[PDB]
């Protein structure tokens, strides 16, 4: 098994054998950023392909050039944690080796005068921590992946939504990765039109005339030529027989014999085969067949030279004779037969007013830059760089692939810019789709939509930065300083470090990380956001992009998505989903060969998946792999239906392939309505980590992956033995076959203790391993927040009964016993950071002091003499944390107060009480104080105190790591000595400093001896300098904001217990708010005196069909019934034979479950450890969509002597009598969401007011005041409550005199308003009078 996983073995009820183990969940973020910052010698990816895309840079004249030769990422100045403390970005300096070559003007071929290569620093790029987060300005962010419409060409329609005739207008659109969009669209007149960048449309052939095409060549491209050749007379015309299909002629057709159709008859298909077998070569038709046809060429009279008839002109009898007299025995004509072909180009070649290239170019200039008179050398330079220049247009490699895939070409790679034939083929397929020889693209197809992620977006911003840099360097290179100029002097690193910094810190997709629990972190790192730069907007996205598409199977979770205004725009990548090298989401499938389902998996994209017949994961299989069924249900071409077991081409690789890792942790998901599964998945990400973590009795087995794959846990990098373990440290001694040669062989994991989360919760790593215990590689050594012994544990197992109790569980409420508060099951710790920033003001600087005026020495009790609170001081709402006073002026004491302070004999001091104070209601312990002083500001006494504590801490930690690693090295050196050439006779005597170079047989043993002495010398020498490094990192000043002298940050830990109002929830969307904390003796109790812990309403089950919370409740009862058995055997002190027998029976129960736990392999020590881990209930794994059937739940209940119906009889705690019907009792895994009522409660009598409008402020941060919005004003108008409404308008908010009069009246026992005009109305009058409009009150 494992060593951490034979501590507590979750009983797995899964029945399918697991073919593909769940991938690394955070490999999206990590793979993409690795591709960004890796050295890519091929130059396709990341920084390298952003550098090679700009460099080499040549001057405007060609006298010189600047060429990239290499790049390198330096070391970060501050580590991930120093960055989070100091509030700075975790970034690395980008050093790029640039070589400036000065070429000769004295040489014709451009010989070089000189080379100067140097390493220029351009920007700092933020490095990604090994958890996929970026530490930007000291806050951890996640750059979520974006799902945008891929570049390429998309043919779409508006399905009869214009011109009110149901006429389908087909439109193609070419979407580059960057550059100008190019749209073609039909009109209800069936004329072809073209937009560029969505502006006003032109006739389409204008673009075809902007290209150097004549009307004759255009009709060559878009048509096929029928030919009339008048040999003697009467319309001798060549015809291929199948042209006439669907055409009805009022003339009959005969040639060289048999007539084949009658006049006025339709030409049938049998007639077509009749024309075929006759091998017909020519047909003579009536002469009026010409009228209505259009000449396919421009014809000129050879006898006179005159223009007879232009091309694209429709022929007539007189025009026909005019052609015939000219000697043109052959005339051509556009084949414009309807309902297979079309005249669309011929007509749009009439409506266009332009007939030559220059006219097309200048008309394009008119539509593009209106109001500007065109110029030929300007119009053609605009047109060339619209679509045909690399610097303004790039159809990216994905664009070219999707392009040639859509136009059905053979080569998937090519030039990144359009060409003549590309636009021609786009128009041709659009015309086809008009005719009916094609079909429109589905815009929501995940073969048409694409994952752009961190390393791609950062490379885009780096490209933008580099192009600003290069447009600066091109003009800077034209100067005369050339021979003395170095490349460092011309590279400005401010555009690059402005672009990347603006993206990483201020973009739409770099979001402040959601750090409630490990599940929040992982699911945030795997969001797929349709929003962002280059994507949709949450208001303009319709109903069709929001819903789930049949290609979302296995690629995107259909049930985990936010419920608000961006439902369906933010998605969550499913469990096994990946991306192509192009960015299209692919998912694995087991290839089915000749009926047997192989274990060879193929990652199919959303377009490859359509061609195959893909079976379900729930399709049964025999021992060797054949489908035991003969008609298996499958998915082909988007639909789903039954097929024979040999038509099947692929198979799903798992049942949880479909859902994301959030919805994968919901046991019995196959029983919940998707509306409630959505809420359960969304609510598992808001559960705060409680004091003492508690595993799920009923889980899905995806807990060990979600916990380990996030970085909350400390997993062992190399197997070994725990050498030392402390609440803040784990020292592992690596095994002998795992340590590299020349190594101490000791891994130190320093655990994170009580740091502030992003959501102000507490993240805290407790050592899981104990002393001397052996650990394997990848074993959890330290549980994080919300992980229990390695598994993710977001909430606690509460004993719920489903029954209505006196209305306290009414309408989604929850009734909690007092023993849930006594045992602190749901008590969570929250850590608040308060900052007191000492400012520089024009009246003088403010000072941090404990000599604040207007406050007695009672409230200054907790401050030390430098003005800052003591660490460990339990402070309450209103306590001064950091005493600060500000120099003030403009008192101008009033006359009565002028008499008052002269009576009692003291005027006010010169300073103002501006000290930091605890907010109202929050009461905690000061657990940390960090003082930052501006470099050049005197450090107060406590700053030096904290600095000496920090310096001795750094010296202690570094001497401790040195004394651990040197101890490991000396142990390894002793091992090398005793391994051969025994010196154990004197090693017990010799001092450790002499072991290093003791003579052994010098073939191999003295080799590692001198190597380990060298390693110890290296350890000492590196400690010797890194100590001074962090010494100067502690002593140095801080790069504070301008204007601040010193910042004191005080951290408060608030142990926040549970109370009525706090939101709790299961995992099946059954949220609720606690109503009452009921006494223990009022809760319903079973025959055994055991009181139920939470009472839930049964009426929340059948309405919202989340039945998964009943089955879980029946399983969590059974899963605890086993625990109460072992708890008995451990208290009776039964033999390990009987314990092993029963635990093996509990592990063997099931209807052909996939796991086999064979305990007879466990030593009696291991069985006793397993029993002590199971005595609180046997954890059960109910994997999603193959979980425990109901019969297994009842069998497990019957094993633990519980009633298989799931319901026991209960007694009222208060009246002592039995409830009339049996009540469902069982153990539900309840969560406590971060919707604490402490954060919600607010009230305000009077406070500060807004500045322009004199209404109150908003939100409990600003001391609020609640918005009496428009609908509430209507609600008062619907009553006759005119006086209530008048006081809500005038004297409560806006009236500035009315509100003070009202306050003095309320105080004086006179409840009477004197309402005037609101200040907003006067503001509105001033704003309307600041237009030219004289609005005025009339008396």
């Amino acid at each position: 098994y494992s060593y951490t996983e034979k501590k507590r073995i979750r009983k797995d009820f899964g029945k399918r054998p697991q073919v593909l183990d769940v991938p690394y969940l955070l490999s999206i973020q990590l793979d993409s950023f690795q591709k960004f910052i890796e050295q890519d010698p091929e130059g396709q990816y990341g920084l390298e392909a952003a550098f090679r895309s700009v460099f080499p840079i040549q001057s405007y004249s060609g006298n010189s050039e600047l060429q990239y030769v290499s790049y390198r990422l330096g070391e970060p100045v501050f580590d991930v944690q120093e960055c989070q403390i100091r509030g700075v970005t975790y970034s690395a300096p980008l050093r790029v080796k640039l070589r400036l070559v000065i070429y000769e003007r004295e040489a014709p071929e451009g010989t070089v005068k000189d080379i100067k290569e140097q390493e220029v620093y351009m920007g700092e790029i933020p490095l990604m921590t090994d958890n996929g987060t970026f530490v930007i300005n000291g806050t951890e962010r996640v750059i979520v992946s974006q799902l945008h419409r891929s570049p390429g060409v998309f043919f779409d329609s508006d399905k009869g939504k214009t011109h009110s005739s149901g006429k389908v207008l087909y439109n193609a659109r070419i979407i580059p990765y960057r550059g100008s969009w190019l749209d073609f669209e039909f009109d209800p007149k069936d004329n072809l039109f073209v937009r560029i960048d969505r502006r006003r449309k032109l006739p389409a052939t204008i673009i075809l005339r902007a290209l150097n095409y004549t009307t004759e060549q255009i009709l060559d491209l878009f048509f096929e030529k029928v030919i009339f050749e008048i040999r003697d007379n009467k319309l001798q015309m060549e015809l291929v027989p199948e042209r006439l299909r669907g055409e009805t002629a009022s003339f009959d057709i005969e040639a060289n014999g048999k007539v084949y159709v009658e006049k006025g008859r339709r030409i049938t298909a049998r007639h077509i085969r009749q024309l075929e077998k006759d091998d017909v070569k020519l047909i003579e038709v009536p002469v009026e067949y010409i009228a209505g046809k259009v000449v396919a060429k421009d014809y000129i009279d050879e006898s006179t030279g005159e223009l007879i008839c232009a091309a694209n002109m429709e022929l007539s009898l007189d025009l026909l004779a005019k052609l015939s007299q000219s000697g043109h025995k052959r005339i051509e004509t556009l084949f414009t037969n309807d309902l297979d072909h079309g005249p669309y180009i011929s007509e749009t070649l009439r409506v266009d007013p332009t007939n030559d290239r220059l006219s097309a170019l200048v008309e394009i200039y008119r539509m593009m830059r209106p109001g500007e008179p065109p110029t030929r050398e300007a119009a053609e330079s605009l047109f060339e760089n619209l679509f045909f220049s690399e610097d303004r247009y790039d159809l990216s490699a994905v664009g070219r692939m999707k392009f040639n895939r859509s136009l059905l070409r053979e080569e998937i790679e090519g030039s990144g810019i359009l060409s003549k034939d590309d636009i021609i083929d786009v128009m041709k397929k659009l015309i086809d789709i008009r005719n009916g020889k094609g079909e429109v693209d589905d815009i929501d197809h995940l073969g048409n939509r694409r994952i752009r992620s961190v390393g791609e977006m950062a490379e885009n911003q780096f490209r933008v930065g580099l192009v600003r840099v290069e447009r600066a360097v091109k003009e800077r290179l034209s100067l005369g300083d050339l021979d003395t100029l170095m490349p460092q002097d011309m590279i400005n690193a401010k555009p690059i470090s402005a672009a990347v910094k603006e993206f990483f810190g201020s973009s739409q997709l770099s979001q402040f990380m959601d750090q409630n629990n490990p599940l929040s972190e992982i699911t945030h790192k795997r969001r797929i956001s349709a929003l962002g730069p280059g994507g949709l907007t949450r208001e303009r996205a319709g109903f069709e992009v929001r819903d789930v598409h049949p290609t979302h199977y296995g690629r995107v979770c259909p049930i985990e998505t936010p419920e608000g205004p961006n439902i369906g725009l933010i998605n969550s990548l499913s469990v096994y989903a990946q991306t192509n090298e192009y960015g299209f989401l692919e998912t694995p499938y087991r290839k089915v060969t000749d009926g047997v389902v192989t274990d060879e998996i193929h990652y199919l994209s959303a377009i490859e998946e359509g061609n195959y017949v893909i079976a379900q994961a729930n399709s049964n299989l025999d021992e060797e792999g054949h489908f035991v069924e003969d008609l298996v249900t499958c998915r082909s071409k988007g639909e789903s239906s039954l097929f024979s077991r040999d038509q099947v081409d692929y198979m799903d690789v798992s049942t949880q392939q479909v859902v994301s890792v959030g919805a994968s942790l919901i046991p019995f998901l196959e029983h919940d309505d998707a509306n409630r599964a959505l809420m359960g998945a969304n609510m598992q990400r808001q559960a705060v980590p409680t004091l003492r973590a508690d595993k799920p009795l009923v889980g899905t087995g995806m807990e060990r992956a979600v916990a380990v794959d996030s970085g909350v846990t400390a997993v062992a990098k190399r197997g070994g033995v725990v050498q030392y373990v402390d609440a803040s440290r784990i020292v592992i001694k690596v095994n002998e076959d795992e340590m590299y040669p020349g190594e101490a062989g000791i891994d130190i994991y320093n655990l994170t203790k009580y740091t502030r989360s992003n959501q102000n919760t507490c993240i805290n790593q407790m050592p899981c391993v104990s002393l001397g215990e052996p650990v394997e590689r990848g074993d959890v050594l330290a549980d994080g927040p919300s992980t229990d012994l390695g598994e993710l544990a977001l909430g606690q197992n509460m004993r719920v009964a489903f029954m209505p109790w006196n209305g306290y569980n009414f309408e989604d409420s929850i009734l909690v016993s007092e023993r849930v508060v006594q045992e602190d099951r749901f008590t969570t710790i929250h850590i608040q950071e308060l900052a007191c920033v000492s400012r520089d003001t024009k009246l003088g600087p403010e000072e941090i002091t404990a000599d604040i005026p207007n406050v007695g020495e009672a409230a200054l009790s907790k401050l030390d003499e430098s003005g800052i609170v003591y660490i460990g001081a339990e402070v309450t709402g209103g306590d001064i944390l950091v005493g600060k006073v500000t120099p003030k002026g403009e008192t101008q004491l009033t006359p009565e107060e002028k008499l008052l302070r002269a009576i009692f004999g003291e005027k006010a001091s010169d300073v103002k009480d501006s000290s930091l104070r605890v907010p109202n209601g929050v009461s905690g312990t000061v657990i940390d104080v960090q003082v930052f002083t501006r470099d050049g500001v005197e450090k107060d006494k406590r700053a030096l105190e904290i600095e000496e504590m920090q310096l001795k801490q750094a010296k202690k930690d570094l001497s401790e790591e040195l004394q651990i690693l040197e101890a490991g090295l000396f142990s390894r050196i002793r091992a090398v000595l005793v391994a051969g050439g025994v010196e154990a006779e004197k090693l017990d005597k010799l001092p450790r400093d002499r072991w290093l170079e003791l003579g052994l047989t010098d073939e191999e043993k003295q080799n590692q001896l001198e190597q380990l002495a060298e390693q110890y010398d290296e350890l000492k020498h590196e400690f010797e300098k890194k100590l001074e490094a962090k010494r100067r990192k502690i002593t140095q000043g801080d790069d504070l904001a301008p204007g601040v002298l010193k910042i004191v940050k005080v951290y408060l830990a608030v142990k926040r217990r549970i109370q009525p109002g706090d939101k709790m929830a299961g995992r099946h969307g059954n949220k609720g708010v606690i109503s009452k904390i009921n006494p223990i003796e009022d809760m319903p109790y079973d025959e055994n005196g055991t009181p139920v812990d939470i009472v839930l309403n049964p009426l929340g089950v059948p309405s919202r069909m989340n039945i998964g919370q009943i089955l879980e409740t029946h399983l969590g009862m059974a899963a605890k019934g086993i625990g109460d058995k072992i708890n008995a055997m451990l208290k009776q002190q039964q033999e390990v034979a009987k314990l092993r027998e029963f635990i093996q029976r509990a592990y063997d129960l099931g209807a052909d479950v996939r796991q086999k736990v064979d305990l007879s392999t466990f030593s009696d020590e291991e069985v006793m450890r397993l029993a002590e881990n199971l005595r609180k209930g046997m954890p059960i794994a109910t994997p999603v969509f193959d979980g425990a059937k109901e019969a297994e739940i009842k069998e497990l209940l019957k094993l633990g002597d519980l009633p298989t119906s799931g319901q026991i009889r209960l007694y009222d705690g208060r009246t002592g009598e039995q409830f009339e019907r049996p009540v469902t009792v069982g153990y539900m895994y309840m969560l406590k969401l971060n919707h604490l009522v402490d954060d919600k409660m607010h009230a305000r009598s009077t406070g500060s007011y807004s500045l322009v409008t004199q209404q109150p402020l908003g939100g409990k941060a600003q001391f609020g005041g609640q918005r009496f919005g428009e609908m509430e004003v209507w609600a008062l108008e619907a009553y006759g409550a005119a006086y209530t409404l008048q006081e809500m308008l005038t004297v409560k908010s806006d009236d500035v005199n009315g509100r003070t009069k009202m306050y003095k009246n309320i105080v004086d026992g006179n409840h009477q308003m004197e309402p005037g005009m609101p200040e907003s109305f006067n503001v509105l009058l001033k704003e309307i009078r600041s237009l030219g409009i004289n609005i005025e009150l009339e008396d």
Binding site: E811, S1245, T1246, V1273, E1287, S1330, I1333
Partner: protein, 402 residues
């Protein structure tokens, strides 16, 4: 208020572009040509004279310099807001409407009678009211008072600027610049470009983006107009005038509390201490327990044990309104009597949940306190929950067991 004396007249963008254009409808001139004359791209003839130079004729500049010799200086054609102001100021209303009233009375195709009665309505509205047409062209610009475009000093050692303060400054520069070019006698092409810039700057101040590309400062995001202050969901009308934030109000999560009577609701002690604070100050000063509102403020923030005995009287018969947004209908605001409870969650009788559409899965409610005797009696007689047991939509009970 202040005022900027515009060096040249400047067309008001509201009466120029807010379809139908009052200036266009008044000059019988198409907007697509008045916009050309105003932005200095075409001439228009103020007075025609004995020539083919009819009044409302637009003539481009190249069609103007040839007219410089065709008819000498007998005519006068201008461009910009001076031209349109001369056209407005020159026309006569009482004569023009009288001239149109017969063309309306004589035409039998109503397609033109539509335009004729539109213009007659406009001219009668201009002559009936005291306005004059030439007031649709600003020559003085008012300036909003400075405490309504406040320049807030930031604690960060900086000044956070308004948007109007830009759109005014941007005007006051160009205007000032123009006032130099009228004294330096700069060539008329560059004072044309500066008058065009001043016109577009005043229009950007009054309504940004009416002329397409809107002025944006330092955020790549359009600056806020004067007309953006008063319109939309964020303008004064819907945001500050028709609904406004309100003192004596609070918010909390709701909880069932089924022991309640239909007319009362559980109110936390910690909220009812804050909402009723001036009432408590009054009862403290009345009963001699304090001598000064500052002494009573200290007694309340310390929460001495007599403050709670005061508070139990202050909220004895004093209804509070409870409101859960969205207030879809009248019963969304109901007044209950507060029962002081010790939690932090407002307890809400189970029967009123259907009327509120409230369910206890995390909802919140606002509490408001009626101050005046009339407001307390309105809350008690009109809005109390025992008076609202029937729905106003239909005569069927809304207080229904659920």
């Amino acid at each position: 208020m202040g005022h900027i004396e515009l060096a040249s007249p400047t067309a008001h963008i509201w009466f120029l572009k807010s379809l139908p254009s009052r200036i266009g409808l008044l000059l019988d001139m198409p907007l697509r040509d008045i916009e050309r004359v105003l932005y200095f791209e075409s001439y228009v003839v103020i007075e025609g004279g004995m020539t083919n130079l009819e009044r409302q004729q637009i003539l481009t500049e190249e069609q103007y310099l040839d007219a410089l010799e065709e008819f000498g200086d007998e005519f006068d054609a201008k461009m910009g807001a001076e031209a349109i102001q001369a056209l407005l100021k020159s026309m006569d209303l009482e004569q023009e409407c009288e001239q149109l009233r017969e063309e309306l009375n004589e035409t039998n195709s109503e397609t033109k009678r539509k335009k004729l009665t539109k213009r007659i309505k406009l001219l009668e509205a201009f002559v009936q009211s005291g306005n004059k047409p030439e007031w649709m062209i600003l020559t003085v610009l008012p300036v909003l008072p400075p405490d309504l475009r406040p320049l807030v000093p930031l604690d960060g050692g900086r000044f956070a600027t308004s948007d109007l303060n830009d759109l005014y400054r941007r005007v006051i520069n160009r205007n000032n610049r123009l006032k130099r070019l009228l004294d330096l006698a700069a060539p008329d092409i560059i004072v044309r470009n500066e008058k065009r810039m001043l016109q577009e700057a005043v229009d950007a101040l009054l309504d940004n983006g009416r002329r397409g590309r809107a002025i944006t400062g330092s955020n790549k995001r359009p600056l806020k107009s004067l007309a953006d202050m008063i319109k939309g969901k964020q303008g004064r009308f819907r945001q500050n005038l028709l609904g406004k934030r309100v003192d004596y109000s609070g918010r909390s999560v709701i909880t069932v509390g089924p022991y309640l009577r239909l007319h009362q609701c559980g109110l936390p002690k910690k909220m009812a201490l804050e909402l009723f604070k001036p009432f408590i100050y009054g009862k403290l000063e009345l009963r001699g327990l304090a001598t000064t509102i500052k002494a009573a403020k200290k007694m309340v923030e310390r929460e001495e044990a007599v403050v709670w005995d005061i508070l139990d009287e202050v909220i004895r018969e004093h209804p509070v309104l409870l409101n859960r947004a969205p207030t879809l209908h009248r019963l969304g605001i109901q007044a209950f009597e507060p029962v002081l409870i010790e939690g932090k969650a407002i307890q809400l009788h189970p029967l009123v949940c259907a009327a509120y559409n409230a369910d206890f899965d995390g909802d919140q409610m606002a509490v408001h306190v009626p101050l005046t005797l009339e407001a307390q009696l309105e809350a008690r007689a009109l809005m109390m929950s025992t008076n609202n047991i029937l729905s106003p939509a239909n005569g069927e009970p809304i207080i229904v067991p659920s």
